[PDB]
Each structure stands twice: as C-alpha cells, then as structure tokens.
Design a protein around this ligand. Structure first.
Ligand SMILES: [Co+2]
Length: 188
C-alpha cells in the first residue's frame, strides 16, 4: 500500500516458534543474554501484548497475547514472563492503564520502566525507531500471520490540521505493533 508505515517488511527476519497457549515461544531463556519486555495492556476487550526481546541478538524470544484478561492477570502474566527471562525489565505503556494496574506493577515488585505513549510525537519516535531497525535487517519476530498482518496494516494518515497519524487500516488493532516498538526502543 502507498501509505504503509513498515515499508521494509521484506527485511524482517521471520522465526519459527512453538505456540504454548497465549505464548508464541521462539527461544527459551538464554542465561548469558539480557532481555526486556515491551508491554501494552488491554482495557475492556482490547488485546494485551508482551514481547520479549533478547537485547544481545535483537530477536524476539517470546510474544504473549490475549484479550479479556483481568487487570491483575495481565500484571501476573507479565511478572511470570519477566521472571522466565531472568527478571527481564519491562518497558510498559502506562498511559491510560488506570490506577489499579500502576499500583499493581509497584505492589508486585515488577522490574519496569514507564514509557507512556501519550502523544503522536512519542508514538512516532517509537515507530520510526522500529521501522529504521527493520529496514536495517535487525528486527526478528515470530513467523505468525497475525503479527505480520498487523505490521502490514499499520498505515499513515493525516489529521484535520494536517498532522501525521499512524494507525491500523480500517478498524484494526495495533497492540502487537506497539508492544514490538516498546521492546525495540531499548535495542542498540
Ligand atoms: Co493496545
């Protein structure tokens, strides 16, 4: 498409995985590597997505996705995933998550850093970084059609004033896109 954000999708490294319920597992924990997790939370029927990135290789080791999970279950699953990957630190989009989730991240002792996606400017920095890394052949994700489709359908639009917006085509989702961008915000 003319308005595609990820014009370098052809450079994406596609990784086999095992589907273990809500997790797509590419690689189990490598203790000699350091990891982080990009985390998008779901309000109401929206998807939550947690993307585990190996910072030593630049590859997604695990991606967990679900909808309809309770707020506490979203935090608990994130905790488990962090623990599974050596207390991997979480890059959490805390914007619009609400008091309960913010309090629970602290109360549960989660290793996390807030990165609130609170404006088009922030979103554009995150996405541009992902897109730049992707075109350089540095992004490697589970070879899953749902993931690739969401990237494929992430597009450019304009606001009434002529400002750039990035969003899903049609009435689609971008929780996977955003989780990935949050993770890759940490990758050098
Ligand atoms: Co979302």
């Amino acid at each position: 498409a003319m308005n595609s954000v990820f014009s370098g999708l052809d450079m994406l490294i596609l990784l086999p995985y095992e589907r273990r319920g809500t997790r797509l597992v590419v690689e189990d924990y490598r203790p000699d590597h350091i990891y982080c997790i990009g985390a998008d939370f779901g309000k109401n029927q929206d998807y939550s997505v947690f993307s585990v990135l190996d910072l030593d290789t630049g590859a997604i080791a695990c991606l967990e996705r679900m909808n309809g999970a309770t707020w506490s279950d979203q935090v608990a699953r994130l905790k488990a995933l962090s623990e599974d990957y050596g207390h991997a630190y979480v890059v959490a989009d805390t914007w619009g998550v609400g008091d309960a989730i913010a309090e629970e991240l602290d109360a549960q002792g989660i290793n996390y850093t807030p990165l609130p996606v609170k404006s088009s400017s922030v979103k554009e920095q995150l996405i541009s970084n992902l897109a730049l890394l992707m075109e350089k052949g540095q992004v490697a994700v589970p070879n899953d059609k749902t993931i690739l489709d969401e990237l494929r359908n992430f597009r450019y639009y304009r606001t009434a004033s002529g400002n750039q917006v990035m969003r899903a085509y049609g009435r689609g989702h971008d929780d996977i896109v955003m989780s990935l961008a949050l993770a890759y915000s940490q990758y050098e």
